[PDB]
Amino acid sequence: MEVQLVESGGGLVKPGGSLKLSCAASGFTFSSYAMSWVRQTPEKRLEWVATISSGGSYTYYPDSVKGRFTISRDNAKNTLYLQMSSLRSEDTAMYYCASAYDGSYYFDYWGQGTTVTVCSGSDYEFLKSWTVEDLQKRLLALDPMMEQEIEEIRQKYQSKRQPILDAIEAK
Amino acid sequence: MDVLMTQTPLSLPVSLGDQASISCRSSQSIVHSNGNTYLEWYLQKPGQSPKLLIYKVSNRFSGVPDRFSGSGSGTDFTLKISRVEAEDLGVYYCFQGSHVPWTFGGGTKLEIKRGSDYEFLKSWTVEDLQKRLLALDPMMEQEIEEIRQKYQCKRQPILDAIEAK
């Protein structure tokens, strides 16, 4: 009675690389409903990725991923899968797992998604001639910058929160 | 040819209590082979996944309040909110499931008329103000994870270079 869809398996990948996404279903009879993957690009555009019938005999893809992505399900394990191969930069998106009600509507319950990031097809060109010292120095230098960008995000949201907190205080 | 879903307007500024109307146009008819028209409206809050509001043009999804209503036919479809409440603010997407590939509209942002300062927040109840405050946390966590992904992508060529020596 407590429906829950939990996606996992996302992360970074190189162009031409591969990833396998998993979606754990609970709180409903998973094997009685079609399942789908829907992604949201960094520009907030939603694109349907794949759909599989309740028993797995029928699968549907758009031409953008046909031949590269395979949707599958394990009704005994109540899990949906998406095998992604030959990944391209336009596949960078948040991938949502979603249940259907066959014949009525397409995307009933959504998980909170898992992020897939396809890295750039460069940067290694000027790095393959550096010394190990300079390479490890670049690795070490990166972590202060990331933590600084995270802290600056937190400051941004502190400024976003303040007028709302002020309005609550003025009641 | 694929069906194109075009939404209008791109953004709709409203005050709480106002009526809201948003349009969705298809590049061709979207009548499924079985005769039904699988046009659906979804609402998404920042940092959170979309949620189904209307299915088959006009059927209200279970739990959707009466103030929401959908209509239309042919290539013109409309979603209307009789009296906008704070929980209705977000990005609305229309979607066609009649012809493969199934496609989404570009989205319409229903946002509050905030003015040139923060005086609009003073007409809000504490409950609505709290919901607005809490809606920021998923958006923050998403931006933080996006930075983590960016730096994993930055440090991967370095790791490959070190491993290749």
Tell me the residue range of the domain where A141 lies.
123-171
At how many Å resolution was this determined?
A: 2.0
How many domains is chain B built from? 1
A101, A139: one domain: no
Amino acid at B122: K
Tell me the residue range of the domain where B63 lies.
5-117
Phi, psi of A161 (to 5 degrees): -75, -30
CB within 8 Å: B129 and A167:
yes
Whole-number Å distance between alpha carbons of B52 and B92: 10
Q: Does B4 touch chain A (CB under 8 A)?
A: no
Q: Does B56 touch chain A (CB under 8 A)?
A: yes
Residue A5 DSSP SS3 = strand
A65, A98: one domain: yes
Q: List the one residue out of A13, A34, A9 whose CA is nearest residue A23.
A: A9
CB within 8 Å: A48 and B165:
no
What residues in A contact B48, CB-CB < 8 Å? 112
Strands A4-8 and A19-26, how do they pair?
antiparallel
Whole-number Å distance between alpha carbons of A106 and A43: 23
A17, A87: one domain: yes
A44, A88: one domain: yes
Q: Does B104 touch chain A (CB under 8 A)?
A: yes
Q: Work out the burial of residue A117: count CB atoms within 10 Å of its CB; fewer than 13 is exposed, 13-18 middle, 19 or more buried.
A: buried
Q: List the one residue out of A68, A90, A69 whose CA is nearest residue A80.
A: A69
Q: List the one residue out of B103, B106, B108 whose CA is nearest residue B88.
A: B108
- Which DSSP symbol is given to A43? T
| Cβ–Cβ < 8 Å for B160, A130 | no
Strands B90-96 and B68-73, how do they pair?
unpaired
A21, A81: one domain: yes
CB within 8 Å: B145 and A115:
yes
How many domains is chain A built from? 2
Any idea which residue has 């066609």 for tokens? B96
Beta strands in A9-159 (DSSP E): 11-13, 19-26, 35-40, 46-52, 59-60, 69-74, 79-84, 93-99, 114-118
Boundary-marking domain end, from A91, A118, A145: A118
CB within 8 Å: A139 and B155:
yes
Does B104 fall in a domain? yes
Does B63 fall in a domain? yes
